[PDB]
Each structure stands twice: as structure tokens, then as C-alpha cells.
């Protein structure tokens, strides 16, 4: 079987202390990245899951290891798909990293524990963000069943089924699994192949890249004579990248501080590409690929490349300070444990506006019926339209209000 990188981005959502990283470990094998220098930029893990089906039974055909000795048939497995995991945070404060991960994703995996309460505030907030940013391919997973009884787990299923009625998603598959015990993983791998079709993705579309994480490979003990370039942990949704192409990071750079700054987007050339495990020349869109650029390892250290757009040379994305948004408000607030009715937007108020991956604090200038004018403190770029989820300060930390679209 030939070595191939990620084809579709599949994420995992749940709640705190459930064990989302243990679920990722049970499916793939390699443990989470977060658990100082390398990887650390946004709260997300990295593990690649292998799907090889033995068609020489039913659900047990899709296996973790490529060599088939487990299901019964001595014949070797056939290549179907290779997937990448982008684990999103399940916390009320960490909202910008969740919405940044949702734009990267194409399919979702929901985790609800048996022993805990049925209506959870964070999972409903993740479900609302899925409905906003178009991620309808959702598989519901039960986290812990062995602590629960025979009838109580069935009653918990009935409460989940009654909860999913008014939402847009109608047909979502439900699987009972365990992370520590390691069971029924083969059924989930079967559902990933069947229920989720890969969207049409072509060579024709102009190259665009979204940077989430920042890698710097500087080793203790090793001298300055051998240095590695600043690798950007970015995700591609459109346009095929290869080795030896010019890249500009759009929003801007702070290098010089009376007067004015007149700086271009950060120019860099691709040196190395990191995909799956081994070195590869081509970058297939629909997966997290570590693009090793000429940009300094000091710039790709920690918290500098969190939600920044990248365009290829010969293309001009526009930089905006005043953005025109077409907003729609929900009935009641999602995320809070008391649920309150969403009030009308007041002029001049700080709101965390997440345009795909960019985290910006924006002030409302004019209030209308459907449209709103917003002024950004830090510049954010717009390419086409981009899916936006709005969040506001009402009670202590940030709470989601609704969805928005740029009309430019």
C-alpha cells in the first residue's frame, strides 16, 4: 500500500474531562500534541488515522493496521482513505480556537457521556457553530457506557433523539464506543466511509492557505551551524501546492515601532513539506500540512501565527479595517448553563468576531434591521465571502449570538 496524506479534515467535539484525546488515541494510536517550542500556538492535537478495508467482514474490514490477521481473511487490506484529526476545545472561555477549527473541518464527531446530564451547554454551543459554518456531516458517539446500566443508556439515547428534532441535521449516525477499553472502533471507521462523501475539489481554483499552528525546530544541545526553517502548520481548502512556490501571509507584520508603518505581506518561499510521516513533494487540499517556509523560527515560535490567511503569488486579497456584515440573530443564548433572550445590538460595543480563523475585537458603528457596520482594531482580510460566527461579552466570558456574512 502506497503512502498518501490526508484527504478529508475530520474534527472531534465534546466536553471538558470527558477524554477527547483518549478517543483520538483509541481510533488512530498516536497521542495528542498539546498534552513549549514546537506545535504550541492553538489548543489542538495531531494524529493520523488509517482506513484500510479488507474486501477479500461488514464493519470489521476497516482496520488500524494495514496487515490483515484480525478479521479472519489472510489476504491483505485495500487502500480506501487516509484521514487527519483536528481536535477542538470544549470550554466556554476557549471559543476563538473552536471557531478557527470549525472552518478547517469538513466532518464532525460529537461526544456525549452517559453518566453526566443530557442537555450539556458546551456541546449545544458546538452544534450551533456547526450549523453556522456548514459542517452537517456529524457522527454522534457515546463516550462511556460501562459505568451506565442496560436501560439507563437506552434512556440516554432517547433523550438525544428527542433533542435532535428542530435542528437542520436530520439523519446523523449514532455509535456506542469506549476509549480506554478499545471496542467498536471498526463500526465508526465504517460510518466515516459510508455517511461522509468527499466534496468536489479541483486543480482549477486559485491557491489559498489558512495557518493555525506554528512549528519551530530548534534542538537543545545542537549548534547554530545546523538550523531548521520556520514551519507553518497550515490547512488548505482550495488550490494544489508544490515545492518551490512563493507565499505571502496577508494581514501584516509588526517589525518597526511616531510616524506610520508601510509594510507589505510577509513574503516566503517553500523549503520543505511535512505530511503524514515521510517527506512528500505535493500538497493535496483537504488536510493539515506543515509548510516549511523561509520565514524565521523566531516568528514561528508560539503565539504569532494564530488565524492568518495566505495567498499565492499573482493574487491580491484585500485588507479591510471597516467591514460590512449581514447578521442574523438567534432566539436565545447558547453556551450558558440560565438561558436568556438575545437583545438588540447597541452602538459602540466590543465583540469578538471570528471570520473563519481570524480573532478580532470589533466595534459596531451603525445598527440596522439586517446589516451592521463594524470597525476592526486589528486588520482582517477578506477573499470571497467567508463564514462568520459572532460572539459577545454579556456574562463574564464570551457567548455566541448568531451568524454573519461579508457583502463586499
Amino acid at each position: 500500500i502506497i503512502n498518501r496524506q490526508a484527504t478529508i479534515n475530520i474534527g472531534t467535539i465534546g466536553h471538558v474531562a470527558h477524554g477527547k484525546s483518549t478517543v483520538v488515541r483509541a481510533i488512530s494510536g498516536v497521542q495528542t500534541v498539546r498534552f513549549l517550542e514546537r506545535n504550541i500556538t492553538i489548543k489542538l492535537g495531531y494524529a493520523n488515522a488509517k482506513i484500510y478495508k479488507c474486501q477479500e467482514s461488514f464493519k470489521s474490514d476497516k482496520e488500524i493496521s494495514p496487515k490483515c490477521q484480525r478479521p479472519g481473511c489472510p489476504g491483505r487490506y485495500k487502500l480506501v482513505r487516509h484521514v487527519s484529526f483536528v481536535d477542538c476545545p470544549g470550554h466556554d472561555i476557549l471559543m476563538s480556537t473552536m471557531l478557527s477549527g470549525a472552518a478547517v473541518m469538513d466532518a464532525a464527531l460529537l461526544l456525549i457521556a452517559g453518566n453526566e446530564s443530557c442537555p450539556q451547554p458546551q456541546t449545544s454551543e458546538h452544534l450551533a457553530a456547526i450549523e453556522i459554518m456548514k459542517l452537517k456531516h456529524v457522527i454522534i458517539l457515546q463516550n462511556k457506557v460501562d459505568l451506565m446500566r442496560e436501560e439507563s443508556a437506552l434512556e440516554h439515547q432517547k433523550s438525544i433523539l428527542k433533542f435532535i428534532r428542530g435542528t437542520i441535521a436530520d439523519g446523523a449516525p449514532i455509535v456506542p464506543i469506549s476509549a480506554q477499553l478499545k471496542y467498536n472502533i471498526d463500526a465508526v471507521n465504517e460510518f466515516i466511509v459510508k455517511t461522509i462523501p468527499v466534496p468536489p475539489r479541483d486543480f482549477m481554483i486559485s491557491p489559498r492557505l489558512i495557518v493555525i499552528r506554528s512549528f519551530d525546530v530548534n534542538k537543545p544541545g545542537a549548534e547554530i551551524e545546523d538550523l531548521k526553517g520556520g514551519v507553518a502548520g497550515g490547512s488548505i481548502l482550495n488550490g494544489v501546492f508544490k515545492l518551490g512556490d512563493e507565499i505571502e501571509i496577508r494581514p501584516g507584520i509588526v517589525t518597526k515601532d511616531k510616524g506610520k508603518i508601510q509594510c507589505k505581506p510577509i513574503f516566503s518561499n517553500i523549503v520543505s513539506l511535512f505530511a503524514e510521516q515521510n517527506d512528500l513533494k505535493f500538497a493535496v487540499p483537504g488536510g493539515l500540512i506543515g509548510v516549511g517556509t523561509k520565514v524565521d523560527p523566531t516568528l514561528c515560535r508560539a503565539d504569532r501565527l494564530v488565524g492568518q490567511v495566505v495567498g499565492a503569488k499573482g493574487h491580491l486579497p484585500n485588507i479591510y479595517t471597516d467591514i460590512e456584515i449581514n447578521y442574523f440573530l438567534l432566539r436565545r443564548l447558547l453556551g450558558v448553563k440560565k438561558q436568556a433572550k438575545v437583545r438588540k445590538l447597541e452602538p459602540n460595543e466590543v465583540l469578538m468576531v471570528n471570520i473563519g480563523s481570524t480573532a478580532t475585537g470589533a466595534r459596531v458603528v451603525a445598527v440596522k434591521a439586517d446589516m451592521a457596520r463594524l470597525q476592526l482594531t486589528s486588520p482582517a482580510c477578506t477573499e470571497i465571502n467567508e463564514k462568520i460566527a459572532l460572539s459577545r461579552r454579556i456574562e463574564k466570558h464570551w457567548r455566541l449570538i448568531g451568524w454573519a456574512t461579508i457583502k463586499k
Binding site: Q157, L161, P176, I177, L181, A187
Partner: peptide
């Protein structure tokens, strides 16, 4: 969909430590 789920749950309860 909650029809093949009940067979998967019964398979899980049968094979436990």
C-alpha cells in the same frame, strides 16, 4: 437514526471486562 444502534449497544454489553 436509532435502529442499528441497539444491536451495537447489545454487542458492546456482551463483550466487556
Amino acid at each position: 437514526v436509532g435502529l442499528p444502534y441497539s444491536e451495537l449497544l447489545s454487542r458492546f454489553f456482551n463483550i466487556l471486562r
